[PDB]
Amino acid sequence: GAMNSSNYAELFNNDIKLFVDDTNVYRVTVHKTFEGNVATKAINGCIFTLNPKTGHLFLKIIHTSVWAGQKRLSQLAKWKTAEEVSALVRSLPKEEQPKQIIVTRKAMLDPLEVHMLDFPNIAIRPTELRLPFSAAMSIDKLSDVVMKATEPQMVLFNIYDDWLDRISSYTAFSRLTLLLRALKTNEESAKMILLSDPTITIKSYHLWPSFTDEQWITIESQMRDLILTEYGRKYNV
Amino acid sequence: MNTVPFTSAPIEVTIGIDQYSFNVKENQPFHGIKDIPIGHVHVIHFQHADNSSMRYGYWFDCRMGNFYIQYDPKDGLYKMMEERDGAKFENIVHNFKERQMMVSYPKIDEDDTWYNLTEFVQMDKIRKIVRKDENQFSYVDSSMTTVQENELSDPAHSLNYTVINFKSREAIRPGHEMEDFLDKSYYLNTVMLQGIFKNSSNYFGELQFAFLNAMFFGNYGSSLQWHAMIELICSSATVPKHMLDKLDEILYYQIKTLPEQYSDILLNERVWNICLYSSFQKNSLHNTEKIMENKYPELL
């Protein structure tokens, strides 16, 4: 059933699984109209579908045209997410199809279950983890490809860059969640930590800077400090 | 007016006949029930004084044969059986009527309750839900499971209600996932009404029979079925107006008849709040909403 702290190593076993996060699928800016009413304007979004073992990220870009003339967009967005995840599964060869799909928000369970009726052996699971995948649009290259899209588009990334050459998927996922938690809590300070030093660059084929093992430990410490900090600035402790 | 005679009453038992019930003491001289209205199905049911485990009973229609009850001391229950010898059976009953050892089916003339609860129920359909073709009558009890329950174990003792499952390929057209899940009208009208039941009368018949098995036997799977058939209509944006009007009457009399003390277990809060307050038909069940609010305001 639900994924939580007790069954956390399951994420890194050899059963193919995907996390699905819909928090950036339907995105809007809220503004005033000439008459002084409020209106929304959609901007491009994305489904964040991640294999936590391999790092493979299936970034389905949701172009604003998919909302045109549609009602109840927040509810449609869950079903559009489910439709696209289902289409992704069918596009994969059988031996690449997930055995489990974990949704980060419980509201996705029925839409995805209904879209996946053709796959009765694929388990659709919620999670009690508060995962920070909403902050994926704080990763500059992901944000850039979403905003530039002029049509629906799937873009494939490895969200771990080359880290798995040197660390395990458990450690890589922990690093990712720490970076994303930091970026979610204080994006400016997080990005300052990541880029302050111009001698460390991001490879054209990567998302994150080319830190050595020792530099990653410094970075990881800075990000914890930042999280605990903000947690102080927030609560006054 | 027809009669279901009893050979004897060897064990103390509460006997029900439709919505009526009376206590029979151990070896009390009881020889059955007379003046049973022709034109309706009926259910005669039993709860033993010594073991309230297993309410059980028989659905029957007196137009289809002469039925009586004999206590079987080996299997330990009151059994319905069908006598073929008309003259022998009538003669005994005739004679039994003379010694006044029968209770009278106690219908108040003003009262349409039973008709209203069984309006669409037909023995022929009961016998397809309850499969035992050598008998004209149908046995049901507390513990019998439904076909759907078994999918999630003895097939011959099952209640073969129509399987309804909102997250199934039957309910959901490929490519209309969201449409069909939020508006079940396709599933109600094409799959179930046109496809499986053929008309709304058979649908209501099964719905009413499910309710009655839930109420009289505490049959939990029947209660599941009754609520599913309600929820399928309420969750459909497009329902014939005559069905909605009839549904309101059906449910009104079911809510009216339900023992007040059994509401906690027989009534699904989620389904009812959804149907009366959130569903497409939230405004189409005036009588049912009024009786539910005055009688079970807690549930809501």
Ligand SMILES: CC(C)CN(C1CC1)S(=O)(=O)c1cnn(C)c1
């Ligand atoms: C309550 C009575 C009507 C039950 N009998 C009906 C006429 C069949 S009986 O004649 O006493 C009877 C009981 N067992 N068998 C084989 C016959």
